[PDB]
């Protein structure tokens, strides 16, 4: 039941989503490098820096994004990056990875200077995502919805963000219905994951301050996108 309009929108989204890659030079380290809180931190920093670049590119290609005011573009990226990265991590942790990558990446994140107070909820959210059995189209669209959120701090023209978001929600709603007609509230449940992504924003500012007081340093890109 997608309309041709919706099909065009979906195709633009998936083309942009599918370019999302983490280089082998980074992911090889999961297995190859030593295991210390220090090296685990460096690995994660390398992953985060790469993923922020990937996300900036995805965001630039979202429908209408280019037509938004330049400062509002920046406010959307800053406001949504953490949530997009949690959702991407949820996708990664419920996906088949090369041999050994899932288990050892989990061990490294659990011994990277992140308190158990934030580890536990993080892996709990990854589990709730796994249980939804999301398709690639659901991940892509939900990510795009997170990025084009009108409530982020410092967005001036909220109304125009809100308009770009609307047809993504429409497509996502028809898709959920078509794919999981036996869980007719699957769309609502995805929106409920949006609410829960908001908690990871708070958790993340705290993780960053803990990392900083244990004298970990971030790349220049990360310092910008997350306000140091």
């Amino acid at each position: 039941e997608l309309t041709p309009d919706q099909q065009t929108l979906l195709h633009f989204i998936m083309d942009s989503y599918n370019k999302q890659r983490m280089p082998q030079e980074i992911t090889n380290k999961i297995l190859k490098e030593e295991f210390s809180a220090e090296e685990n931190f460096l690995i994660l920093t390398e992953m985060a820096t790469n993923h922020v670049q990937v996300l900036v590119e995805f965001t630039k290609k979202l429908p209408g994004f280019q037509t938004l005011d330049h400062e509002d573009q920046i406010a959307l990226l800053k406001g949504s990056a953490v949530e997009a990265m949690f959702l991407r991590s949820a996708e990664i942790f419920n996906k088949k990875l090369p041999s050994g990558h899932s288990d050892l990446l989990e061990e490294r994140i659990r011994n990277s200077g992140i308190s158990d107070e934030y580890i536990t909820p993080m892996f709990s959210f990854y589990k709730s995502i796994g249980e939804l059995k999301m398709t690639q189209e659901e991940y892509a669209l939900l990510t795009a919805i997170v990025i084009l959120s009108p409530d982020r701090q410092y967005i001036k023209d909220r109304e125009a963000v809100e308009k770009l978001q609307e047809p993504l929600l429409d497509v996502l709603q028809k898709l959920c219905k078509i794919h999981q007609p036996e869980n007719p509230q699957h769309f609502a449940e995805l929106l409920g994951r949006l609410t829960e992504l908001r908690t990871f924003n708070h958790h993340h500012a705290e993780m960053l301050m803990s990392w900083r007081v244990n004298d970990h340093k971030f790349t220049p890109l990360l310092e910008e996108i997350w306000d140091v």
Binding site: V56, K60, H70, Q73, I74, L77, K78, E224, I225
Partner: peptide, 10 residues
């Protein structure tokens, strides 16, 4: 800040 601005016009 500098970097993000640049990546957005690339």
């Amino acid at each position: 800040h500098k970097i993000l601005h640049r990546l957005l016009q690339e």
